[PDB]
Design a protein around this ligand. Structure first.
Ligand SMILES: Nc1ncnc2c1ncn2[C@@H]1O[C@H](COP(=O)(O)OP(=O)(O)OP(O)(O)=S)[C@@H](O)[C@H]1O
Ligand SMILES: [Ca+2]
Ligand SMILES: [Mg+2]
Ligand code: NA
Length: 315
């Protein structure tokens, strides 16, 4: 499942070739085009790398720290230069300047799935079939080629583009950045597995739960916890809990599931196997790769780019 198409292979090749001409990234070499979005930790701008004329997505993390620490983070991020896959957002480089860490990556014109969802209302099962394939393959690539696990799978961390590509981003690679950022910068735990929320076991199985939860949210058009009422579902398809309470609910209540009747039994079974509370019983990457839903989706000819462009008004 890590084999590359001819089109994919050619695209990866082209990306590196361009990346080759870039050189050392410097603060003054960038011109801001617009703000792509913000989160807990930093802001992401669409930028122009003046010298190369290349457009990039520049993530700025404001962190006041000493040269020692800063220089450590920058070193850890260098590993991102090794993560090359059609399912991982391209990396250009990282540097520090004027009290802010910069992470420059490939620009994904379709934005994140959380932004796409807001606009679509809800995402069709067939489209989610392609999203599932991409996430599984992205997690597989990270585990296999880098012995890395994502740790932060969620809709805002799944990027898409007008070329119909779906890629993962923001997978923890720098312990230092996490530490220093663990200060005023702390992301949502609402997609974390029950086991991770209990300081218990935590491997790639944890990422599979996050994916399963993200898929349900996208299919129904709302963060699925707690479960919707027969009345909401009725308005949804015709057919406020505090963070700490939400986390307790996740750990103590049964996992969410898709509503029946509206989705295929195969899709329902797929998410169910991703959402089994017990990580030992929960399906693994290898099993998911051959799941009926995945096999069916893979063989389907879905024009993701077309659906995407018309959905968000791209163009
Ligand atoms: N390469 C990229 N191309 C296009 N848009 C991007 C890219 N990277 C990030 N974005 C957008 O920028 C938004 C903010 O990114 P982040 O700073 O990582 O925050 P977040 O992931 O939304 O939330 P946190 O920080 O994890 S709580 C994302 O949700 C995307 O919409
Ligand atoms: Ca400057
Ligand atoms: Mg992110
Ligand atoms: Na600057």
């Amino acid at each position: 499942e890590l084999e590359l198409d001819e089109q994919q292979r050619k695209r990866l090749e082209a990306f590196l070739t361009q990346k080759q001409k870039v050189g050392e990234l410097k603060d003054d070499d960038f011109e801001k085009i617009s703000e792509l979005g913000a989160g807990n930790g930093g802001v992401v701008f669409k930028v122009s790398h003046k010298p190369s004329g290349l457009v990039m997505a520049r993530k700025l993390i404001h962190l006041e720290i000493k040269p020692a620490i800063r220089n450590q983070i920058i070193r850890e991020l260098q590993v991102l230069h090794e993560c090359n896959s059609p399912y991982i957002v391209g990396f250009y480089g990282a540097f520090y300047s004027d009290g802010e860490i910069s992470i420059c990556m490939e620009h994904m014109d379709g934005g994140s799935l959380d932004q796409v969802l807001k606009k679509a209302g809800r995402i069709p099962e067939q489209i989610l079939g392609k999203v599932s394939i991409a996430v599984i393959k992205g997690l597989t690539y990270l585990r296999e080629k880098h012995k890395i696990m994502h740790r932060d799978v969620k809709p805002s961390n799944i990027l898409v583009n007008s070329r119909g590509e779906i890629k993962l981003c923001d997978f923890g690679v720098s312990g230092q950045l996490i530490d220093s950022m663990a200060n005023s910068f702390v992301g949502t735990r609402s997609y974390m597995s029950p086991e991770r929320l209990q300081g218990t076991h935590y491997s790639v199985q944890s990422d599979i739960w996050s994916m399963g939860l993200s898929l349900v949210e996208m299919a129904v058009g709302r963060y699925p916890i707690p479960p919707p009422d027969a009345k909401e579902l009725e308005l949804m398809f015709g057919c406020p809990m505090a963070i700490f309470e939400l986390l307790d609910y996740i750990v103590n209540e049964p996992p969410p599931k898709l509503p029946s009747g509206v989705f295929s039994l195969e899709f329902q079974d797929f998410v169910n196997k991703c959402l089994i509370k017990n990580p030992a019983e929960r399906a693994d990457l290898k099993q998911l790769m051959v799941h009926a839903f995945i096999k069916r989706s893979d063989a389907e000819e879905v024009d993701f780019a077309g659906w995407l462009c018309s959905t968000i008004g791209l163009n």
